[PDB]
Design a protein around this ligand. Structure first.
Ligand SMILES: *[C@@H]1O[C@H](CO)[C@@H](O[C@@H]2O[C@H](CO)[C@@H](O)[C@H](O)[C@H]2NC(C)=O)[C@H](O)[C@H]1NC(C)=O
Ligand SMILES: *[C@@H]1O[C@H](CO)[C@@H](O[C@@H]2O[C@H](CO)[C@@H](O)[C@H](O)[C@H]2NC(C)=O)[C@H](O)[C@H]1NC(C)=O
Ligand SMILES: *[C@@H]1O[C@H](CO)[C@@H](O[C@@H]2O[C@H](CO)[C@@H](O)[C@H](O)[C@H]2NC(C)=O)[C@H](O)[C@H]1NC(C)=O
Ligand SMILES: *[C@@H]1O[C@H](CO)[C@@H](O[C@@H]2O[C@H](CO)[C@@H](O)[C@H](O)[C@H]2NC(C)=O)[C@H](O)[C@H]1NC(C)=O
Ligand SMILES: *[C@@H]1O[C@H](CO)[C@@H](O)[C@H](O)[C@H]1NC(C)=O
Ligand SMILES: *[C@@H]1O[C@H](CO)[C@@H](O)[C@H](O)[C@H]1NC(C)=O
Ligand code: NA
Ligand code: NA
Ligand code: NA
Ligand code: NA
Ligand code: NA
Ligand code: NA
Lengths: 558, 558
């Protein structure tokens, strides 16, 4: 029948609707909210700023904030597994870059074509929900759901490190200064000899006379605007050297990670009460942020800070929030815009479904059942709504969702004569995501407070999340201690039943696939990256050949 | 009889003399030498500089280096337990200060009186060796040998941290600068209006005319010498702000400690060969120094460096190395100088014997026997020699000796059946100390290489040594997990046979004594600090009262 899977999922999920809200009456829920609000805001603002730069000021940060708030609210209220956090995906930012120049190349209107493409993508997603294609989830095995996770976590860690490495270019220090000659250490703005006729043109259309302007007062920004030349002993590539800002950022970045790691380990200590070993051990990354913000405020070094937009009206002065599919375009662009819609729908479907498969793993001991058809239906509906309103596209994010799940773990009480309380289950609820995405939409009113949060602290939090998300994957348990290392082995039940060289070959097979994914990740096919989930399944099928089925579904499997 | 204990100790130690040299044919010996050379040099130079400042340039760093080399060589060649490292104690830099005002307030010669006092102290030490008073070692129990270790280690850690905290005063950064106004950020030396008549006097006896001198070129050191005034936007309390030197020092200090801790943990890893898990796991703090020196050289920020003196002749131009007891003093100062000799001999005897008791603990599983009379005899002989030559006094150091012993530990090669390799014994030898104290005396020729070692790296090494020396003390094993904490307990055999509240009272008794030692450590009695070892024994005697002897020598004396 049609819509049969959706009806079955709604019937399964309906009984637990009230329990989903009632189960959120503990402190760990507020701890997760405060943990994830800051860690989820920063990517949204960065993506919004990048898209506004790429689109000449059409889709800026405020539209990204509003779209994220709307999509998160309507996903947390009505969906399947509510522990999935929708988040702005890098890939998208690629799809606009080719699009806008395309709209610049011929003579087309960007917003109308984008809205038509989004509407047709939403229609195709609804059709896919009708056909019940999500049953293809039955084909994904542990092989993919333990490679993709490792690749995404490693990429996240590398991006977190690269974001810190980038700070050295903007804030360049002096590699060779004499501490005895500080009396002769200054930068001065002077007029440029024989300036380029381009700059002369600039001055003329700005009515700028070289002679009358005082040059010895112009500050760095004004000097760069007026195209001046710096002449001094503290000059650099472009602009005076910035003293002691980079190393303070490095100290902030590493101290935040180390302090969070230390504070998230009081559930193993013994010299404390039971209400102090689980109240500053579940609040490890919110106490860290406050402490580091206070330290940064006391020291007073001007490190980069978080800028949240203050206005509420749209960025472009003529962007009243509605976009008809066709207002300044020929009628055939609607019928041509459907061609990219198939690719976009397939890509979004595969990304959302692989994230849902990763989240609903059997090791998390889910009690309330999960549904895949409703997730895709609501993702498509909000994709259409966001496309009509002129808002950026949002799909599931893997690292954020894994960190959300890991923050609601429930552990038992004993552990000294035993160890690390046995994991009993994930706290199943719907208030955490709703509150996170409500607070995201209200950040326009709390700008005066969010301006005190330095960026290196957020980068350290990102690195901590990326490192902590690794714990749990089965891949590493082989990769770490099987391929090369030593001779003796741990228990590792799968060995209790199979040859060692077979395990080596199995690990090598996964490693080659991971390397291939990394190589073709950036390449020229980053546009169609997640489509590769259609390739690992083919390799898994072509593995029963030189593998007996017993070894096959004993060393993989689950 | 007379000298009986010395004869017995010589008879015990004679058989193993050749084995002591032959057992030093492994790599761990060179590893210990390279570990301890740098960690032992820096205190010597710092103490020498401080004493030269306090004595107006009579006993500078070069005399300290030469005295340390001589004393270490003659102690390693002929002594008892050769794992004790003689080192310049802090207490002395106080005697040799007061003894300076004196020789001035009155009208005495410093070197002659100091030599007479040292000679009489050496004579009293030889008499103590003759009387065989070192048998009083039989009275020291585990109670003291586990406080005086904990107190010394904690003091060492605090001093290592304070040495880093001190760097903020010399290199002061700017707590509030505007990054847009770097075009107006400079310091300028200008002539001081209505300068003090003191400075006028200075200029007159130096023939310095205010008018003709150019003030806009004088550098920071020249400006401070000429008593100028700084007038600019980058000025501070005294002198221009130093950009990005303090935070680089902090990064060096903490990175060295973290990297050393990480590198000294490859004896637990499993994904490496057996010749790479014990060649960069016993060379953990010498690879760290090289890596951090290379990083500091590549970055190029002018952090403080290690200054080793280059000259070989004595500091004062008339200090030909010999000092007759009386050359410019009345003949009764020799007979009066004996009064402080009793106190100095008692103090040195108690310090050396408590260090020897700590080192020769039964847990280290010493095979070759130890002797206490010969240690004191040779310490006294070299104290007399150093006093005659005009060199600073050297006695045993606790943290350095403990780190020397811990660096020669021999571990087994079986961690799979059981656990971490069971400690088999301390490698007993005499080449390590001899080579360390030979290399210390040759540092005057390798100044061009030692100048590249930054000081924060050495402070990080000091902190690592102070932290690692804590591991092993029984005190903490109670202090950590008995007094306040939780309800359940580990095995801890002493409990297998006694009341818990008794253990609490026992720990409280030790804590009160430790607090008293800390309080009277600085006080006004730091001169007579180690004499307190005569007080803990009295408390130990007055503990059998409200303690049955069974509980007493089951929880206490091991
Ligand atoms: C670059 O600036 C120069 C300097 O004013 C200008 O060069 C003139 O170029 C035109 C032809 O394009 C000539 O007829 C003039 O004689 C040139 N000026 C001189 C002083 O020789 C011009 O403004 C800029 N050059 C170009 C090619 O636009
Ligand atoms: C920069 O502008 C100021 C403002 O006129 C001038 O520099 C000095 O500013 C202070 C404070 O306002 C006053 O003593 C005088 O206005 C200026 N002192 C002088 C010129 O000796 C000046 O116009 C500009 N500075 C330079 C170097 O051109
Ligand atoms: C401090 O400098 C002042 C300024 O030159 C001097 O003060 C003179 O003090 C003597 C007595 O000590 C008087 O006879 C002079 O008349 C003082 N000078 C003036 C100008 O009044 C002197 O060099 C210094 N002061 C002292 C007390 O030594
Ligand atoms: C500092 O001494 C120098 C040396 O005479 C002078 O400053 C300039 O130095 C450069 C390089 O030697 C030369 O252009 C001239 O010697 C100086 N230029 C000038 C004075 O315009 C000057 O004597 C001193 N500087 C000041 C500011 O007094
Ligand atoms: C330059 O001069 C013109 C005419 O004199 C004037 O219209 C224009 O506004 C001036 N430029 C600026 C930036 O005001
Ligand atoms: C100052 O002048 C006197 C005599 O004119 C001279 O002896 C003295 O050397 C000069 N000062 C210096 C530092 O040379
Ligand atoms: Na990711
Ligand atoms: Na990231
Ligand atoms: Na994803
Ligand atoms: Na010490
Ligand atoms: Na120290
Ligand atoms: Na000592």
């Amino acid at each position: 029948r049609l819509f049969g899977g959706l009806i079955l999922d709604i019937k399964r999920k309906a009984p637990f609707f009230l329990s989903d809200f009632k189960d959120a009456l503990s402190l760990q829920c507020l701890a997760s909210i405060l943990f994830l609000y800051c860690a989820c805001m920063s990517p949204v603002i960065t993506f919004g700023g990048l898209l506004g730069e790429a689109t000449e000021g059409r889709i800026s940060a405020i539209e990204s904030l509003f779209g994220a708030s709307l999509t998160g609210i309507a996903y947390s209220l009505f969906a399947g597994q509510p522990l999935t956090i929708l988040g702005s995906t890098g890939p998208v930012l690629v799809f606009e870059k080719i699009l806008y120049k395309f709209c610049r190349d011929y003579q087309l209107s960007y917003l109308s074509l984008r809205t038509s493409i989004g509407l047709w993508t939403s229609f195709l997603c609804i059709v896919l929900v009708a056909t019940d294609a999500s049953s293809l989830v039955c084909y994904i095995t542990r092989f993919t759901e333990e490679a993709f996770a490792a690749l995404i976590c490693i990429i996240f860690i590398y991006e977190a490190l690269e974001k810190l490495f980038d700070l050295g270019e903007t804030y360049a220090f002096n590699m060779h200064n004499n501490l005895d000659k500080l009396t002769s250490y200054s930068c001065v703005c002077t007029e440029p000899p024989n300036p380029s006729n381009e700059t002369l043109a600039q001055w003329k259309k700005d009515n700028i006379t070289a002679h009358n302007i005082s040059w010895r007062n112009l500050t760095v920004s004004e000097c760069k605007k007026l195209r001046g030349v710096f002449l001094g002993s503290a000059c650099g590539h472009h602009g005076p050297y910035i003293p002691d800002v980079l190393f303070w950022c490095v100290i902030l970045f590493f101290t935040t990670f180390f302090l969070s790691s230390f504070l998230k380990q009081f559930k193993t200590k013994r010299y404390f009460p039971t209400k102090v070993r689980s109240t500053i051990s579940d609040f490890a990354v919110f106490l860290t942020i406050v402490i580091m913000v206070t330290i940064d405020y006391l020291v007073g070094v001007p490190s980069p800070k978080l800028h949240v937009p203050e206005k509420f009206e749209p960025t472009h002065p003529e962007r009243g929030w509605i976009i008809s599919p066709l207002g300044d375009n020929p009628w055939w662009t609607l019928l041509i815009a459907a061609i990219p819609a198939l690719l976009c729908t397939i890509l979004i479907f595969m990304d959302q479904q692989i994230t849902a498969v990763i989240i609903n793993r059997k090791e998390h001991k889910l009690k309330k059942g999960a549904g895949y058809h409703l997730d895709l239906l609501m993702v498509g509906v909000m994709l259409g709504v966001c496309s009509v309103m002129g808002l950026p596209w949002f799909v599931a994010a893997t690292v954020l969702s894994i960190s959300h799940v890991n923050s609601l773990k429930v552990e038992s009480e004993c552990s000294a004569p035993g160890e690390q309380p046995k994991f009993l289950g994930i706290r199943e609820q719907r208030v955490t995501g709703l509150m996170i995405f409500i607070l995201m939409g209200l950040s326009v009113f709390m700008t005066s407070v969010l301006k005190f949060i330095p960026m290196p602290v957020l980068y350290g939090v990102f690195l901590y999340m990326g490192v902590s998300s690794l714990k749990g994957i089965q891949l590493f348990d082989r990769i770490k201690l099987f391929g090369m290392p030593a001779k003796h082995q741990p228990d590792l039940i799968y060995l209790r039943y199979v040859p060692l060289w077979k395990v080596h070959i199995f690990t090598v097979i996964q490693l080659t696939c991971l390397v291939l994914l990394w190589v073709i990740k950036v390449s020229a096919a980053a546009v169609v990256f997640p489509m590769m989930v259609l390739a690992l399944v083919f390799v898994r099928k072509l593995m029963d050949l030189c593998f007996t089925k017993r070894e096959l579904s004993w060393l993989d499997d689950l």
